[PDB]
RNA sequence: AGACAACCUGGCGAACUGAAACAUCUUAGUAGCCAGAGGAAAAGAAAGCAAAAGCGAUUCCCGUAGUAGCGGCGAGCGAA
RNA sequence: CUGACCGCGUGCCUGUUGAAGAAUGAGCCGGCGACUCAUAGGCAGUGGCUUGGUUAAGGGAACCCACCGGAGCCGUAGCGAAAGCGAGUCUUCAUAGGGCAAUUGUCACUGCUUAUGGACCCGAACCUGGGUGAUCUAUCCAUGACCAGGAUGAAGCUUGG
RNA sequence: AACCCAGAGCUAGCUGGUUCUCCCCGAAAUGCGUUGAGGCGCAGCAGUUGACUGGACAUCUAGGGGUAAAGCACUGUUUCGGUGCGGGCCGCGAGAGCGGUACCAAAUCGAGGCAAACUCUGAAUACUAGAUAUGACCUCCAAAUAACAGGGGUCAAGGUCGGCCAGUGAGACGAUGGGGGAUAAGCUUCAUCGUCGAGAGGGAAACAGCCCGGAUCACCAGCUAAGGCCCCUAAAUGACCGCUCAGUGAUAAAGGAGGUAGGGGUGCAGAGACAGCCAGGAGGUUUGCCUAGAAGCAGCCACCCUUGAAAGAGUGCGUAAUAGCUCACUGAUCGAGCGCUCUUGCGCCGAAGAUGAACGGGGCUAAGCGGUCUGCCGAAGCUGUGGGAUGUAAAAAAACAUCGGUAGGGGAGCGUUCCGUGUUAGGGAGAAACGCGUGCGUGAGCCGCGUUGGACGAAGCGGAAGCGAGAAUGUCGGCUUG
RNA sequence: GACCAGGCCCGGGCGACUGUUUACCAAAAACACAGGUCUCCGCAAAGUCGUAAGACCAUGUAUGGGGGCUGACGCCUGCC
RNA sequence: CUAUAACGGUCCUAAGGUAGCGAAAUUCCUUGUCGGGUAAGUUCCGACCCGCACGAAAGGCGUAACGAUCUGGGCACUGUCUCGGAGAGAGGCUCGGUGAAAUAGACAUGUCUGUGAAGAUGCGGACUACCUGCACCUGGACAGAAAGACCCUAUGAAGCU
RNA sequence: CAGGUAGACAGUUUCUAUGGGGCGUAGGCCUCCCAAAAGGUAACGGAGGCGUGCAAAGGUUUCCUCGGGCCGGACGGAGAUUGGCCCUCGAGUGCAAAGGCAGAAGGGAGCUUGACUGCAAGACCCACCCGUCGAGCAGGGACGAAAGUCGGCCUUAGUGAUCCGACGGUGCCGAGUGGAAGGGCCGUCGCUCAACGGAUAAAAGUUACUCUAGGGAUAACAGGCUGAUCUUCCCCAAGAGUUCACAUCGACGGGAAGGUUUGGCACCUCGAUGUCGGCUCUUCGCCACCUGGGGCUGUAGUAUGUUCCAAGGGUUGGGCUGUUCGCCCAUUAAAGCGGUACGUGAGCUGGGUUCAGAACGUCGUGAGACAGUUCGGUCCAUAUCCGGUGUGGGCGUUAGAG
RNA sequence: UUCUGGUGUCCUAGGCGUAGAGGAACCACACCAAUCCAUCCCGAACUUGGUGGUUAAACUCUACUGCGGUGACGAUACUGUAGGGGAGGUCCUGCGGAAAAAUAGCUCGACGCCAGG
């Protein structure tokens, strides 16, 4: 009687959001047709799959108005650090091991 | 009928001791002078 | 010619159960009943096992091995 | 020791989202009554030994046992279904590329837990084998016994035909 | 489908039971698969252990999404008017034509909405990813005097992999966004949080799931939170500003209202008002029709003009209808505050049940509700003083930081019968059951202390278990209640 | 004349009748029965019991035996 | 006349209910209509018929007799009733003797309302009530009795097909 | 020994969800919404599809791109071939929808088989089992002048573990040795295993003759929440009432209280809360039937009709049914509606329903069955406590008594 | 160093309409024939080979706001937290974030690069 009810459950989201750490090979974008579009350093897939061939940085923007464009960088910079606490808890460990 | 009535829980939430003027809610207690300290009150010297 | 605690040999031989059901299988050839006999019985002197090397009638304990293998290749059974 | 009077305080266990519960259970008292053992795998603690560890069955002037008993097991080489090759090997035309390797203890005692056993204790309706049952009752068989008292009045038989 | 004995202590994913102390940590009631959904396997969330770690909290910036809201570009519906195409109808006439109809309808335009499966747009949060700091205390050395930076020592804190092992798998309500339902349920179903579950205490009269708040202990000490200050119960029947007269103050609507304090607009008020007493209050005309009659007053049409201070083809009653009555309107005296209007606050009626006032009671006109300022009460919270315990940690301390807790995990202990040390120490001036000792311990329990009887047996360091009971409609015995 | 000692009619349904049946909640229209038909059996029958010997059947013998349904009596017992 | 169809056409099967009976131990709707009975009768008897779903040896229809059968109306007879009452016996009641039972957490065991696992002597507020016997009634203590027999579940048991 | 063959006899099965069970539907995958702007998400929540198709609808190198309006040309018709203007990708893309795509993934051509072998860093999802993408390398090719693209199809459905068997190919084992049987291994194929993580290669019912273990986790009676329904109300009123909305009835619609009908949830109670109807005995509520007083009346009076205060009282006897306005008879002032676990079974009957027998109609081949009918069918009790009716005793009443 | 077309890349996106200006060079059409080729029919396209006439078309350049695109601030919706009101449907304050819409407006893009006269 009630005919309904046959959902399928299927997941599709954003893998790799603007400006995170893409590896090589990794998925930016698994999608359903072509929202997103290949710029440069990506590979569509076979079914539409937005994936990274170089390390580096995703940058979505519009390759026309209405257009994503998802690309990627190289992006390494700022070796440079600031951080007191890390060299804190490593520096524990020894002073601790060493009293016990 | 027509009219739903308000049960345990749901009761409460109608019916509890709420401070509803907001003068009351705003009020502080007294601070007082700042007391200054105390002596000791013990001591072996004796 | 009757008797027997348990052990033993023979004949007949289940089921609840395990397989998360159940018909192959497992409990198990167990239980029980019948038939003999002994202080032990049954087995036993090779038409055996082996493997290019050797053994040497049976019967038990260890160990190979919970291995090889068998199995709705399931539960499980399991040698030499 | 007893308690004037005041205040606070909706038994206990099981079990539930939720019980003082008008859910369970127990009359009270005292006892009896529930994760045990065997052998094995794994892990931890402890100890012995180690450029190895350990013995089992079996002996031992009983049983325990000092000593003996090295057969056996564990740790030493992997890869492969296998032949095989071996610090490598399988997959392949190939390093290519990849997978897995390129190393490790052991024995025992004490806990935990798993596995087979009735396996934490109590509780089924039931199943199957063997035997005892017809003095009750249900048919039958043999052989006995019983059925007051009255009423009706058939067929046959006999007469007026 | 007998009964007894045996396999048989059958099996039971089902019910009930599971005993001595303390200490630390402490969940879930979700997904998936299941002949599976009042089971079980894996994950998810405990414990404990070993590494590698880096955070967690706050702040800020990026990145994608289409939700809330909005919108009519899209799709689907949607009203009002425009436009007229084209069609039907009248017929003229034996072809289609100009047209006409208060005519039916297709595209379009203007105005106008609506939608989980509509979007040209589109937040806040959430999420992911980056950098940015600094927490709590100390001891300090040098200060006039601080502060902080200067170090040194602590303490507190996140995770991601593993090992050994659990329990859990139908949660409940509240807040929000929703489905189903009837925008009914203390209903059901999911998403994000809180409490209960597993958590005490105070407020709520009583009252898991609401508010504050988190229980290591002692204290015949204090300050507060939520809530409160007339009596029962602690604390002002305390201040001033207002508002209610129903016992409202404790419960429900549409609707009704010259209740009541105010406000927002409106005109009138010596070319004097609403009060009342008053006077006047029409000619055409019986408006035309209809009707027996319609004459203001059955009904309908014209619905004006004249006169004047003023009269509407008459406001109502009434008459067969007329007439009659009276309104509107208009002048005089008395005399200058009265209409209209919507909403604010608190109220009234609408608002009625079955044992007896049900709302804490006594009551109250403030001891009710609206507003501000001061004092107080108020908890197991915070303070003060003094003990305990865990780790952090490896040693005397001392110092921090914690110490609710069911399922469950880990640590440390007591006790009982028996064995090794023993034919032990001790013991007929007397072994154990009963009690005085708040002696002693965090506790399970231990020391002592006594009796008519009266025979055995500790302590210490160790070992083993038929080892710890109020829960099984347990079970054996003795006893009661009725 | 105390004790003892039939209440009776009118109309229905079901069962023809007397009888038997749930020992301890059902005495009935349920079962049975006299009758009816069907069908099987030639005598070392069919049927039943027993693994087998064999025993009922039957020391009977086709108007006799086993089985199924309907249940006096009256008229009947259709079609596929 | 109007109707109901004596009689016809269609798919159908292997054929399409014969005789009797009929709202029936079978008719649901349904106390079906009508007649008799009754003062009034959903029961009852006689009929009609659209037999939801009667029907010919799971026999049809009817039958005299018989029934501790079911069913309707009668006359006689009455405490069945109107509407109770008195009486005798045995118990109850009191005294002497012997002396159980099931149940039982402990009970120092009020009413009304409110609350609460949403129907409390055990909680809150108010009212009410000297302590304790005996006889009497049974509204509560979700009173006793049997781990419900209805409902569901169990990869329960058993019987029959 | 072999084939057939009586459930005569045996050994067993017969799923779960299911806002109680049964009946009905459903069970796997895909797409959209609920899904709360990452992912994920539940409901017998709302819409649909799939269990394929294609030797090309594949691969490449090229070229152009649809529609729907209007204008032209005979029938040609509203809509078919042929030329000119707006266009948002409104066309299509084999089949459903969503996202996509107009240098196209739309259409058409040219040649071709890459819908190859050996593979693969890393990712995505993530209980596991599964599943998805993949830069890049080697061989050997297609297309293309070359650059380059090509290991299936615009993407997401078109599919199912293991065991076992089957076929083709093997420079692997082959139980003394050589063989072989057989097996291994690589490529594959075989189940609408659809209940789609599939208990076996192979299994339906019924129990009212039942029975055990459990459950208020899930029902029926009753209580509670909720009022959809039901009772009673109030608002607006179009009208009707000769005229006249409100003497009286009040269409169309709206706002409430009740808690007793039918229901919804399923919270207590399955180690048990004994059902319908009568008897006896209560007691309470009102929104009132009758008696007491009153308005208004389209009230002459007598009757009334309606509302208002009123629960003090009253609220018959019968015929039919097991059956509270279901009802005819005769009255009567009237002959009420209710609550009290549809009051009352430790007070009563057992006519009904839920026991075992039996039969009728019907369903089922059958055992049996029907919230259809019909005839029969032991409803147990010496009050502990609260409650109530009676009656006492002690004691209080302050000296003791009548 | 302007100008001429040659290629491209950030993007407010860039255009259609009305206007103009362009021939010495460049660009493009009219013209001409046909091997390679090509038109499923056609030198229409595509092709090779010629004449080399206009700027008409197309392109380029400068204006325009009539359309198209774009787009505010403010305010308000809404929403995080902390609370409250209402028997509910749902409403309201405190601190934080903050629009769509409309209107005003804002654009007829900014840079490179090489061969030139």
């Known amino acids: 009687t009630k ?56 940058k979505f923007e519009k390759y026309g108005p209405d257009k994503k464009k998802v690309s990627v960088y190289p992006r390494e910079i700022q070796p440079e650090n600031p951080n007191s606490y890390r060299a804190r808890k490593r520096e524990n460990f020894r002073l601790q091991r060493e009293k016990k | 009928s027509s009219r739903p009535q308000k049960k345990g829980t749901a009761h409460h939430m109608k019916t509890r001791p709420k401070k509803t003027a907001r003068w009351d809610i705003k009020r502080g207690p007294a601070v007082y002078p700042p007391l200054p300290p105390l002596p000791a009150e013990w001591t072996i010297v004796s």
């Open chain 1, 3 to 58: 005919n309904g009810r046959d959902s399928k459950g299927q997941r599709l989201g954003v893998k790799i959001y603007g400006d995170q750490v893409a590896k090589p090979g990794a998925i930016i974008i698994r999608q359903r047709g072509t929202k997103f579009h290949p710029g440069k350093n990506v590979g569509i897939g076979k079914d539409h799959t937005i994936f990274a061939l170089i390390d580096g940085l995703v």
